[PDB]
């Protein structure tokens, strides 16, 4: 199924008929970072399998729902169960849910992920406000926009220089300062490793040379689809480890360690994103 | 349809039957840089849709013709409407028209494109004679030659060290000197960004570190197919902007700005390529 | 055909029924480096075309057999005819034979390849014990593990920090010292160029900047599948040329030159790998 105007329209029509919510904010949350979704008020849960044209997710399994409702007095739509390109989903499957958000009225998209630290200032449990990216898939002919352009959504050749909104980064930092956790908050450049293997020790060393601050396996595809259709983005990485220190000390990384860092920071991140939503212009 | 010997032969047979021209030079022109094609003498226009085994181009639309005739006393074939990999065309679709040129008798291929400047010496409106490349798709398993080798055209493992003919570069520069525009002409290394998003500010900074002079979304696939089958190549980039300066000043780039630079340099480039064709050994 | 537990099991069942050998060591040999396979004792040759679910290899042609038997008193299985990703084989086709090795009982995989030298210490005819890698396909969304995870074989997110076993590297070097050829043996980082074009001169210069010691078109996919399912790996490159020196002197490389270096070192490499097999813990 192509992520075109007609197919996105049919999905949006279904959602409007069952939910009654017209959202202007969308959220996509990293693994272990989804508690805010469970606290959406007056919520409507819409399984992906019930939505016309949504991608089939039964091979990977686990949860896959759109959740609409209110947070901090604002109307939101959340993806509960994220689609990642290392799972084998196509460009069209990743793009369709973001283009549905656009047709529903979304103007701002808030994203979190788990990532490895490259910059030597970064420690496990730190946050990074993403200010730019290095898209290895895109340089290598696997950009999320390879294919015919869908002209109703945006231009053939997008400019990404303002993909990460500067005022949203400033608001996130201001809230951290108000609650005395600004010592955990950095800014940086995100390298997209297609995955699903963690970056090797020698890949980490290369990324240091190339000016990358953090590395992960998500986020950039959704940012590009959002920027193409005019949705503003804030993206925040939670640092699971420093891959450069681990390489120098011969220390390993695993998904269990990543999820334990997520559990340690989950409540703080939930409160931070609730306040960002409340305060958005 | 595979870009094999039998399929290329059937296309070549059709073209010979309708055009009567046996070309020894081929041309592929960048967007806004195609006026020379309209001035081919005693011309025969052959739509792609009429040629056996040529790729289907109706989803993208717009023009798609082969044009044969004479320029400066030499017999040429031009592609009018270029196939780009960011549109979703396969390796086989890109390769077939170049292999048809080979079977028609083409010995030299002349190429122009629009590109972004990385080297700090480069300004909008400058030209770059390409002397080498960094092929991010090829390093990343998206080389145009991935697939079975077509042995009638060339070897399993080509060497690209002489892909950009040195004497053709020297002739192009000599003509610029004769007409007092050599101050616009540089040489450099071309980075292939698969596209269709412009290189991000942080990607531009990375390319500076890695020794790239210019960046664009075309040219390298055709160069590789030509080199594989023994066709000599001259490739020239027209610089639309300096991406490093734009990153330092927070200035944007768009396709409209690119096309306006093309219009400013179109007549000079047309005259330059007509004289190169006339003077080729 | 997916490289899943049921499909690998059916292939393993066939092999057990015809061969009677339960191997604990697997070998994959580079082009021109396969003489050791012909000297396996009490050998059973099983063509790929006869094994349920093995990939079809008739388009490329040439040899394709599994060979089981004894070397130096140990039970081994060899791939005779290697599957390379530049030929167009999918992730699933590359992975299935390694996962069959796992189900047959393989605990150690020994690999050789031909490569180009980047580090200035490396000369034609030298050997490099691989200690890490830079996987350009994997960074660019063409990792061999892209797709659903096969949970019976390994985790969704593997760590590659110990993919190249340190004690196997030490044993290989010790044997070289015992036979007075340690002056030919180096260690280094392997860059995976998807291929099939040799790295361009400007690509070689980039790899020097990024800390790569050698470059080739194989090995990394098999290493990743082996590491995912818990098989230890030793990987050795034979250096065909120094690509940096060749770029500085404008000297070409071709497959004929590569095969002549292979012939010069074939007997030494055969004897070295026979002794490694004999001495493995
Ligand atoms: N303290 C503020 C509200 O702050 C919400 C918040 C708590 C913890 C982290 C970020 C925001 C008043 O009350
Ligand atoms: N001036 C030369 C012919 O030069 C053709 C040319 C004009 C402008 C740019 C490049 C070549 C004589 O007459
Ligand atoms: N020389 C040892 C056995 O060495 C086998 C070997 C020969 C050449 C290269 C590597 C190992 C005793 O006899």
Automatic annotation (TrEMBL), chains A, B, C:
The keyword Glycosyltransferase applies. Residues 24-269 form the Nucleoside phosphorylase domain. GO terms for cellular component: cytoplasm. Keywords: Glycosyltransferase, Transferase. GO terms for biological process: nucleoside metabolic process. It catalyses: 2'-deoxyguanosine + phosphate = 2-deoxy-alpha-D-ribose 1-phosphate + guanine; 2'-deoxyinosine + phosphate = 2-deoxy-alpha-D-ribose 1-phosphate + hypoxanthine; guanosine + phosphate = alpha-D-ribose 1-phosphate + guanine; inosine + phosphate = alpha-D-ribose 1-phosphate + hypoxanthine. Pathway: Purine metabolism; purine nucleoside salvage. Transmembrane segments: none annotated. Pfam families: PNP_UDP_1 (PF01048). Adenine binds at residues 199, 241. Its EC number is 2.4.2.1. Cytosine binds at residues 199, 241. Cytidine binds at residues 198-199, 217, 255. Hypoxanthine binds at residues 199, 241. InterPro entries: Nucleoside_phosphorylase_d, Nucleoside_phosphorylase_sf, Pur_Nuc_Pase_Ino/Guo-sp, Purine_phosphorylase. Belongs to the PNP/MTAP phosphorylase family. The purine nucleoside phosphorylases catalyze the phosphorolytic breakdown of the N-glycosidic bond in the beta-(deoxy)ribonucleoside molecules, with the formation of the corresponding free purine bases and pentose-1-phosphate. This is Purine nucleoside phosphorylase. It comes from Schistosoma mansoni (Blood fluke). The lineage of its organism: Eukaryota, Metazoa, Spiralia, Lophotrochozoa, Platyhelminthes.
């Amino acid at each position: 199924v192509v992520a075109n105007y007609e197919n996105a329209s049919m999905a949006a029509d279904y959602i409007k008929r069952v939910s009654n919510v017209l959202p202007d904010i969308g959220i996509i949350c990293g693994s272990g970072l989804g508690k805010l979704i469970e606290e959406i008020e007056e919520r409507k849960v819409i399984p992906y399998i019930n939505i016309p044209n949504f991608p089939k997710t039964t091979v990977a399994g686990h949860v896959g729902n759109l959740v609409l409702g209110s947070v901090g007095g604002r109307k939101i739509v959340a993806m509960q169960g994220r689609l990642h390109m290392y799972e084998g989903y196509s460009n069209q499957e990743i793009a369709l849910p973001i283009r549905v958000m656009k047709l529903l009225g979304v103007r701002v998209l808030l994203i979190t992920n788990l990532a490895g630290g490259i910059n030597r200032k970064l420690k496990s449990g730190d946050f990074v406000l993403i200010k730019g990216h290095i898209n290895f898939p895109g340089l290598g002919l696997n950009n999320v926009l390879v294919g015919p352009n869908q002209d109703e959504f945006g231009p053939r050749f997008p400019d990404l220089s303002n993909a990460y909104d500067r005022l949203l980064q400033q608001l996130a930092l201001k809230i951290a300062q108000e609650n005395d956790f600004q010592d955990l908050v950095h800014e940086g450049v995100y390298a997209f490793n297609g995955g699903p293997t963690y970056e090797s020790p020698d890949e980490s060393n290369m990324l240091l040379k190339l000016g990358c601050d953090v590395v992960g396996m998500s986020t950039v595809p959704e940012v590009i689809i959002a920027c193409h259709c005019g949705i503003k983005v804030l993206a925040v990485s939670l640092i699971a480890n420093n891959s450069i220190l681990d390489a120098e000390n011969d220390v390993s990384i695993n998904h269990e360690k990543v999820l334990a860092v997520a559990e340690k920071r989950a409540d703080l991140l939930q409160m931070w994103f609730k306040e960002i939503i409340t305060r958005l212009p």
